[PDB]
Amino acid sequence: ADKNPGSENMTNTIGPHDRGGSSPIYNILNSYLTAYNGSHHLYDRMSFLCLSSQNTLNGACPSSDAPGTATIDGETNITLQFTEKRSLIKRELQIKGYKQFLFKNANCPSKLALNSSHFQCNREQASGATLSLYIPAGELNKLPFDGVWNAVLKLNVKRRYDTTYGTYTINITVNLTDKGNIQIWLPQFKSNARVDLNLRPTGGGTYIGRNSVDMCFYDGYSTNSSSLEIRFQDDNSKSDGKFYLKKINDDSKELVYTLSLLLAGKNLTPTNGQALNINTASLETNWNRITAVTMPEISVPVLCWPGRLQLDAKVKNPEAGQYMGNIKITFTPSSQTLDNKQVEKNITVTASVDPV
C-alpha cells in the first residue's frame, strides 16, 4: 500500500461501441492509487495538472495549483483531442477527472478538482491520494465518423506548490462502429441494379460482351477492418465455378461469362461460389457519399473501399431468345469480437441475341 508517485504509462481501450445507442460512461481510472505513505505526510497534497490550459493536444485543464486556500470540490473538465486513424480527422472530447484523499485514521472521501488545495480530515493530514478519470455518458456520439480514435492524455503529478514527481501518459483508443450501415453501395442504382452484357457479333458465329458495375464496400468502421470477405454466387449448383445466364423460357439453354473485380487497387477474379478473403492493409480508400441503409436515403460521406466489377462474355453457339442471370454479392468485414451478419447485393444481368 506504500507507493511513491512518479511517471507512468498506460493504455486504455474503449468499445467497440456501436452508434446504435447512447454511449455509457467509460472508466479510464477508478480511484487509482497515485501516492501513499504510512509514516510521513509528504503526499498530503497531491495535485494533477494539464500541460496546458489551452492546447488540447494532450488534454487542456487547469495547469497551475489553484491559488485559493479553500478546496475546489467536484470534478475537473479536461478537453482532449482525438485523432481518427484512417482519415486523420480530429475532434475534441470532454474527459472528467478528480482526486480523492486517503487518511490513516479518518475518512473524507470527498471529490476534489485535480488542481485543488488540500484539507485535513478531523485534523489529520492525508497520507496519499487516488485519481479517477472517466468519459461521460454520450460523449462518443460527438465523434463525427466511425473508426478508431486515438488521444494521448498527459497529467503532471506533483506535490502542490512543490516538486513535480512525474507525468502520467494515458493512451486512449476509442473504437466506434456503425454496423447497421455496413453495406455494398451501388453509386448507380437506387434499389436494384441491372445491366446488359452488350452482346456484339463479329468474326463468324462468335459473340462479344462487356459491361461493368461500380461499387463501394463499407465496413461501418472507416475501413479499420483488418480484412474482408467477399463472394459472388449464382444459383446454378455446379463445381464448375462459372457464371451462366439462362434464357427466360427453357432450362439449360445458357451462355457463360466471367467476372473480374478491381478492388481498391487490387485485381481479382472471383469464381462462382468461392469467397475471397482480402487483407485490407494494402487497399486504397475513397470518400464517398452513401445513402444510410436503415433510415431514409439521405447520404452521408464515409471512407470506403472502391470497386469495379467487370463482366466479360464471349460465346459461340448461343441460342435465339433472351438471357438473364443474377449475381449475389455478399460481404462480411472482419470483426474484433463478434461476426458481422453478412450483407448482400443482387445484380440482375441481361443478354441480347440478335437474329439478322
Short mmCIF file of C-alpha atoms in Angstrom, two decimals:
data_model
loop_
_atom_site.label_atom_id
_atom_site.label_comp_id
_atom_site.label_asym_id
_atom_site.label_seq_id
_atom_site.Cartn_x
_atom_site.Cartn_y
_atom_site.Cartn_z
CA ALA A 1 0.00 0.00 0.00
CA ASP A 2 3.01 2.28 0.25
CA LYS A 3 3.51 3.94 -3.07
CA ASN A 4 5.85 6.62 -4.29
CA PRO A 5 4.49 8.88 -7.01
CA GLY A 6 6.30 9.16 -10.38
CA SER A 7 5.78 8.90 -14.14
CA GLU A 8 3.65 6.09 -15.58
CA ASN A 9 2.43 5.00 -18.99
CA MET A 10 -0.82 3.33 -19.53
CA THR A 11 -3.12 2.32 -22.27
CA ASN A 12 -6.80 2.15 -22.27
CA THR A 13 -9.10 0.67 -24.94
CA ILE A 14 -12.77 1.65 -25.01
CA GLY A 15 -15.56 0.00 -27.03
CA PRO A 16 -16.32 -1.23 -29.71
CA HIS A 17 -19.26 0.95 -29.11
CA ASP A 18 -21.84 0.92 -31.88
CA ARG A 19 -23.52 4.22 -32.65
CA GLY A 20 -26.81 2.39 -32.39
CA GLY A 21 -27.11 3.60 -28.78
CA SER A 22 -26.13 6.49 -26.47
CA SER A 23 -22.70 5.92 -25.01
CA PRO A 24 -22.31 4.63 -21.46
CA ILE A 25 -19.82 6.24 -19.04
CA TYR A 26 -16.43 4.56 -19.53
CA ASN A 27 -13.85 4.42 -16.73
CA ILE A 28 -10.28 5.34 -17.56
CA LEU A 29 -9.06 5.34 -13.92
CA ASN A 30 -11.12 4.38 -10.98
CA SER A 31 -9.61 5.64 -7.67
CA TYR A 32 -6.23 4.70 -8.92
CA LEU A 33 -3.61 4.99 -6.20
CA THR A 34 -1.03 7.66 -7.03
CA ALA A 35 0.87 8.08 -3.77
CA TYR A 36 0.72 6.79 -0.24
CA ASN A 37 2.93 6.65 2.83
CA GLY A 38 2.27 5.18 6.29
CA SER A 39 4.71 7.33 8.28
CA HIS A 40 5.17 10.70 6.70
CA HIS A 41 2.90 13.29 5.19
CA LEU A 42 4.74 14.27 2.06
CA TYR A 43 1.84 13.06 -0.01
CA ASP A 44 -0.65 15.16 1.94
CA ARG A 45 -1.45 17.42 -1.01
CA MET A 46 -1.24 15.65 -4.32
CA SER A 47 -2.41 17.59 -7.40
CA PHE A 48 -2.62 16.83 -11.05
CA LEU A 49 -2.09 19.40 -13.79
CA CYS A 50 -2.54 19.55 -17.52
CA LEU A 51 0.45 20.62 -19.62
CA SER A 52 -1.66 23.45 -20.89
CA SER A 53 -4.92 25.12 -20.18
CA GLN A 54 -5.46 26.00 -23.85
CA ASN A 55 -3.77 23.38 -26.00
CA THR A 56 -5.90 20.28 -26.13
CA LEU A 57 -3.32 18.09 -27.80
CA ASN A 58 -2.66 16.22 -24.58
CA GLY A 59 -5.63 17.48 -22.70
CA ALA A 60 -6.45 21.02 -21.57
CA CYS A 61 -7.36 21.89 -18.00
CA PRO A 62 -6.01 23.93 -15.19
CA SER A 63 -2.28 23.75 -15.36
CA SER A 64 -1.49 25.54 -12.10
CA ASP A 65 -2.22 24.93 -8.46
CA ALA A 66 -5.44 26.55 -7.52
CA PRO A 67 -4.43 29.80 -5.85
CA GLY A 68 -7.27 29.78 -3.21
CA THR A 69 -6.79 28.01 0.09
CA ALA A 70 -10.37 26.69 0.19
CA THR A 71 -10.74 23.39 -1.63
CA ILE A 72 -12.37 23.13 -5.07
CA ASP A 73 -14.89 20.31 -4.72
CA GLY A 74 -16.12 18.20 -7.58
CA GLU A 75 -14.61 17.24 -10.90
CA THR A 76 -12.24 18.71 -13.44
CA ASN A 77 -13.17 19.16 -17.16
CA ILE A 78 -10.41 18.03 -19.48
CA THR A 79 -10.72 18.82 -23.19
CA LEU A 80 -8.80 16.20 -25.13
CA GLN A 81 -8.21 15.92 -28.83
CA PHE A 82 -8.86 12.53 -30.54
CA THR A 83 -7.49 11.65 -33.96
CA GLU A 84 -9.15 9.13 -36.24
CA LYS A 85 -6.67 6.61 -37.57
CA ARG A 86 -7.56 6.09 -41.23
CA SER A 87 -8.92 9.52 -42.09
CA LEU A 88 -6.89 11.56 -39.63
CA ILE A 89 -9.94 13.61 -38.70
CA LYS A 90 -9.65 15.45 -35.36
CA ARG A 91 -12.28 16.02 -32.71
CA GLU A 92 -12.08 17.00 -29.06
CA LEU A 93 -13.94 15.12 -26.34
CA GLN A 94 -14.52 16.01 -22.67
CA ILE A 95 -12.92 13.86 -20.05
CA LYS A 96 -13.67 14.25 -16.32
CA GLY A 97 -11.12 13.95 -13.61
CA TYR A 98 -10.98 14.16 -9.86
CA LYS A 99 -8.81 13.17 -6.89
CA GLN A 100 -9.66 11.76 -3.52
CA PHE A 101 -7.57 11.86 -0.33
CA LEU A 102 -6.60 8.91 1.91
CA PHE A 103 -6.30 9.43 5.66
CA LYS A 104 -4.82 6.86 8.11
CA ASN A 105 -7.34 7.24 10.82
CA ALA A 106 -10.32 9.03 9.28
CA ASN A 107 -12.39 9.12 6.08
CA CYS A 108 -13.02 12.15 3.93
CA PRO A 109 -13.55 10.66 0.53
CA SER A 110 -14.86 13.98 -0.90
CA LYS A 111 -14.06 14.57 -4.60
CA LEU A 112 -11.64 17.39 -5.36
CA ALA A 113 -10.79 19.11 -8.61
CA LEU A 114 -7.48 17.97 -9.89
CA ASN A 115 -5.70 21.22 -9.10
CA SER A 116 -7.40 21.74 -5.66
CA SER A 117 -5.70 22.74 -2.42
CA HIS A 118 -5.50 20.09 0.30
CA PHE A 119 -7.52 19.81 3.53
CA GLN A 120 -7.35 17.82 6.78
CA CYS A 121 -9.92 15.35 7.97
CA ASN A 122 -10.66 15.61 11.69
CA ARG A 123 -7.27 17.41 11.96
CA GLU A 124 -5.36 14.60 10.33
CA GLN A 125 -3.25 15.28 7.31
CA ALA A 126 -3.66 12.99 4.33
CA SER A 127 -1.16 10.24 3.65
CA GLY A 128 -1.89 9.75 -0.08
CA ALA A 129 -4.39 10.26 -2.96
CA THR A 130 -6.25 8.47 -5.64
CA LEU A 131 -7.09 9.64 -9.18
CA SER A 132 -10.19 8.99 -11.29
CA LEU A 133 -10.82 9.82 -14.93
CA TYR A 134 -13.78 8.88 -17.00
CA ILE A 135 -15.58 9.72 -20.22
CA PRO A 136 -19.13 10.98 -19.53
CA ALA A 137 -22.17 9.31 -20.93
CA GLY A 138 -22.89 10.19 -24.53
CA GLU A 139 -19.53 11.76 -25.36
CA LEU A 140 -18.89 9.25 -28.10
CA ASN A 141 -21.88 10.49 -30.10
CA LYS A 142 -19.91 13.66 -30.80
CA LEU A 143 -17.24 11.92 -32.82
CA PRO A 144 -18.13 12.71 -36.44
CA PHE A 145 -17.14 9.44 -38.20
CA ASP A 146 -16.94 5.72 -37.33
CA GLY A 147 -13.44 4.24 -36.74
CA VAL A 148 -10.53 4.13 -34.36
CA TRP A 149 -9.92 7.27 -32.41
CA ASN A 150 -6.68 7.97 -30.51
CA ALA A 151 -5.69 10.50 -27.90
CA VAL A 152 -2.76 10.75 -25.64
CA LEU A 153 -3.68 12.28 -22.30
CA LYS A 154 -0.98 13.75 -20.07
CA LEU A 155 -1.20 14.89 -16.48
CA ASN A 156 1.54 16.20 -14.19
CA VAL A 157 1.62 14.57 -10.76
CA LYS A 158 3.03 16.90 -8.10
CA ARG A 159 3.07 17.96 -4.50
CA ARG A 160 1.08 21.18 -4.54
CA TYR A 161 3.29 24.23 -4.74
CA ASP A 162 6.16 21.78 -4.55
CA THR A 163 8.23 19.31 -6.54
CA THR A 164 6.63 17.65 -9.56
CA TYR A 165 7.05 13.90 -9.29
CA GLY A 166 6.50 12.96 -12.89
CA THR A 167 3.94 12.69 -15.66
CA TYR A 168 1.11 10.33 -16.37
CA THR A 169 0.71 9.31 -20.00
CA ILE A 170 -2.55 7.66 -20.90
CA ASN A 171 -3.09 6.42 -24.43
CA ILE A 172 -6.84 6.17 -25.05
CA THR A 173 -8.24 4.37 -28.04
CA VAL A 174 -11.88 4.52 -28.86
CA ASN A 175 -13.36 2.00 -31.26
CA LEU A 176 -16.58 3.35 -32.73
CA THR A 177 -18.75 1.41 -35.13
CA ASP A 178 -21.91 1.72 -37.18
CA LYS A 179 -22.84 -1.88 -38.03
CA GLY A 180 -26.32 -1.06 -39.31
CA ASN A 181 -24.54 0.81 -42.09
CA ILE A 182 -22.25 -1.96 -43.28
CA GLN A 183 -23.20 -2.21 -46.94
CA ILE A 184 -22.26 -2.76 -50.53
CA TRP A 185 -23.07 0.57 -52.15
CA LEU A 186 -24.04 0.91 -55.81
CA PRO A 187 -23.49 4.52 -56.80
CA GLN A 188 -25.51 3.91 -59.95
CA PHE A 189 -28.58 2.14 -58.66
CA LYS A 190 -31.11 3.24 -56.05
CA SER A 191 -32.70 -0.07 -55.05
CA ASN A 192 -31.90 -2.71 -57.66
CA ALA A 193 -29.03 -2.90 -60.15
CA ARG A 194 -29.43 -4.49 -63.60
CA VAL A 195 -27.01 -4.44 -66.56
CA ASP A 196 -26.76 -5.77 -70.12
CA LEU A 197 -23.73 -7.62 -71.42
CA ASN A 198 -23.98 -5.58 -74.62
CA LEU A 199 -23.69 -8.57 -76.94
CA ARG A 200 -21.84 -7.92 -80.20
CA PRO A 201 -21.33 -10.27 -83.14
CA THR A 202 -18.06 -10.45 -85.06
CA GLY A 203 -15.80 -12.93 -86.85
CA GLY A 204 -18.47 -15.51 -87.66
CA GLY A 205 -20.90 -17.27 -85.34
CA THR A 206 -18.95 -15.64 -82.48
CA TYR A 207 -20.11 -13.03 -79.98
CA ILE A 208 -18.74 -10.38 -77.59
CA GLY A 209 -19.96 -8.79 -74.36
CA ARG A 210 -18.61 -6.42 -71.72
CA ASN A 211 -20.09 -4.16 -69.11
CA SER A 212 -19.19 -3.07 -65.59
CA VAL A 213 -20.75 -2.07 -62.28
CA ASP A 214 -19.14 0.39 -59.84
CA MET A 215 -19.45 -0.19 -56.09
CA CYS A 216 -18.16 0.65 -52.57
CA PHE A 217 -17.69 -1.66 -49.68
CA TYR A 218 -18.36 -0.01 -46.34
CA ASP A 219 -17.50 -1.74 -43.03
CA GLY A 220 -19.27 0.65 -40.71
CA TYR A 221 -15.78 1.45 -39.35
CA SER A 222 -13.99 3.94 -41.66
CA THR A 223 -12.11 0.98 -43.17
CA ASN A 224 -10.41 -0.05 -39.92
CA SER A 225 -11.40 -3.66 -40.51
CA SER A 226 -8.27 -5.79 -40.89
CA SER A 227 -9.69 -7.89 -43.72
CA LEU A 228 -12.85 -8.56 -45.55
CA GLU A 229 -14.62 -11.41 -47.20
CA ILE A 230 -16.44 -11.11 -50.45
CA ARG A 231 -18.28 -13.64 -52.51
CA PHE A 232 -20.15 -13.82 -55.77
CA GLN A 233 -22.81 -16.52 -56.08
CA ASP A 234 -25.33 -17.51 -58.75
CA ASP A 235 -27.85 -20.29 -58.05
CA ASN A 236 -26.70 -22.89 -60.57
CA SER A 237 -25.15 -25.51 -58.40
CA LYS A 238 -22.12 -26.84 -60.16
CA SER A 239 -18.48 -27.01 -59.13
CA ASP A 240 -17.59 -25.52 -62.48
CA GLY A 241 -17.05 -22.16 -60.81
CA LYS A 242 -18.52 -20.49 -63.88
CA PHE A 243 -21.21 -17.86 -64.33
CA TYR A 244 -24.15 -18.76 -66.51
CA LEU A 245 -27.01 -16.66 -67.86
CA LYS A 246 -30.14 -18.59 -68.97
CA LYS A 247 -32.90 -17.83 -71.48
CA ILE A 248 -36.18 -16.75 -69.89
CA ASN A 249 -38.13 -19.76 -71.22
CA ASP A 250 -36.19 -23.05 -71.40
CA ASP A 251 -33.80 -24.66 -68.89
CA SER A 252 -30.14 -25.48 -69.75
CA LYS A 253 -30.11 -23.11 -72.75
CA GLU A 254 -27.33 -20.95 -71.33
CA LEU A 255 -24.25 -18.85 -72.17
CA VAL A 256 -21.36 -18.12 -69.80
CA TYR A 257 -19.34 -15.08 -68.77
CA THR A 258 -16.66 -14.20 -66.23
CA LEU A 259 -16.26 -11.59 -63.54
CA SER A 260 -13.12 -9.71 -62.77
CA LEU A 261 -13.01 -7.14 -59.98
CA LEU A 262 -10.81 -4.20 -59.37
CA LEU A 263 -10.98 -3.70 -55.62
CA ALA A 264 -9.46 -0.66 -54.11
CA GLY A 265 -6.36 -1.05 -56.34
CA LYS A 266 -6.16 -4.87 -56.43
CA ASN A 267 -7.08 -7.16 -59.32
CA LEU A 268 -9.14 -10.23 -58.57
CA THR A 269 -11.06 -12.89 -60.46
CA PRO A 270 -13.86 -14.25 -58.35
CA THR A 271 -15.23 -17.63 -59.42
CA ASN A 272 -18.78 -18.63 -58.63
CA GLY A 273 -19.21 -19.83 -55.09
CA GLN A 274 -15.72 -19.02 -53.86
CA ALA A 275 -15.28 -16.39 -51.11
CA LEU A 276 -12.20 -14.15 -51.27
CA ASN A 277 -10.53 -13.08 -48.03
CA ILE A 278 -8.70 -9.87 -48.67
CA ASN A 279 -6.23 -8.24 -46.33
CA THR A 280 -7.01 -4.54 -46.14
CA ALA A 281 -3.53 -3.31 -45.33
CA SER A 282 -2.74 -2.54 -48.95
CA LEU A 283 -6.17 -1.44 -50.25
CA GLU A 284 -6.97 2.17 -51.12
CA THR A 285 -9.84 4.12 -49.64
CA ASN A 286 -12.05 6.87 -51.08
CA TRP A 287 -14.50 9.29 -49.62
CA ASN A 288 -18.00 8.62 -50.98
CA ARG A 289 -21.43 9.88 -50.07
CA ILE A 290 -23.52 6.86 -49.42
CA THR A 291 -27.18 6.53 -48.57
CA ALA A 292 -27.92 5.37 -44.99
CA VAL A 293 -29.05 1.72 -45.24
CA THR A 294 -31.58 1.71 -42.44
CA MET A 295 -33.20 5.18 -42.12
CA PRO A 296 -34.07 7.44 -45.08
CA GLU A 297 -31.94 7.75 -48.23
CA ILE A 298 -30.12 10.97 -47.29
CA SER A 299 -26.42 10.37 -47.94
CA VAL A 300 -23.52 10.92 -45.54
CA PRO A 301 -19.84 10.85 -46.53
CA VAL A 302 -17.85 7.82 -45.40
CA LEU A 303 -14.43 6.39 -46.10
CA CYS A 304 -14.88 3.07 -48.07
CA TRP A 305 -13.19 0.70 -50.49
CA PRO A 306 -13.99 1.47 -54.16
CA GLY A 307 -14.60 -1.38 -56.57
CA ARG A 308 -15.38 -2.00 -60.19
CA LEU A 309 -16.90 -5.35 -61.21
CA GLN A 310 -16.27 -6.20 -64.88
CA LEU A 311 -18.28 -8.73 -66.92
CA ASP A 312 -16.73 -10.39 -69.96
CA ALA A 313 -18.66 -12.81 -72.11
CA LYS A 314 -17.65 -14.48 -75.33
CA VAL A 315 -19.70 -17.38 -76.60
CA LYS A 316 -20.23 -19.25 -79.84
CA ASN A 317 -23.31 -21.43 -80.36
CA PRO A 318 -25.71 -19.18 -78.42
CA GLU A 319 -29.45 -19.80 -78.93
CA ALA A 320 -32.18 -17.34 -80.02
CA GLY A 321 -34.37 -15.76 -77.33
CA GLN A 322 -33.34 -13.62 -74.37
CA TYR A 323 -30.95 -14.08 -71.47
CA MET A 324 -30.92 -13.25 -67.78
CA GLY A 325 -28.86 -14.28 -64.76
CA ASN A 326 -28.39 -12.92 -61.27
CA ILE A 327 -25.26 -12.19 -59.24
CA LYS A 328 -25.30 -12.30 -55.47
CA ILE A 329 -22.56 -10.35 -53.80
CA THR A 330 -22.08 -10.92 -50.08
CA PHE A 331 -19.77 -9.01 -47.84
CA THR A 332 -18.52 -9.50 -44.36
CA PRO A 333 -15.94 -7.19 -42.87
CA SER A 334 -13.64 -8.70 -40.26
CA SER A 335 -14.54 -8.32 -36.62
CA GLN A 336 -12.60 -7.92 -33.39
CA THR A 337 -15.07 -9.92 -31.24
CA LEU A 338 -18.32 -10.95 -32.99
CA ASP A 339 -19.17 -11.62 -36.63
CA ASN A 340 -20.99 -9.05 -38.72
CA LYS A 341 -24.05 -10.52 -40.37
CA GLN A 342 -23.06 -10.88 -43.99
CA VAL A 343 -24.63 -8.09 -46.00
CA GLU A 344 -25.73 -8.53 -49.60
CA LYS A 345 -26.47 -7.01 -53.01
CA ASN A 346 -28.02 -8.58 -56.07
CA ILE A 347 -27.29 -7.76 -59.65
CA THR A 348 -29.52 -8.79 -62.50
CA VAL A 349 -27.82 -9.43 -65.83
CA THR A 350 -29.36 -9.32 -69.36
CA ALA A 351 -28.15 -10.56 -72.75
CA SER A 352 -29.24 -9.94 -76.32
CA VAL A 353 -29.23 -12.48 -79.14
CA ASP A 354 -29.60 -10.73 -82.48
CA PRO A 355 -31.24 -12.64 -85.36
CA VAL A 356 -30.02 -10.95 -88.56
#
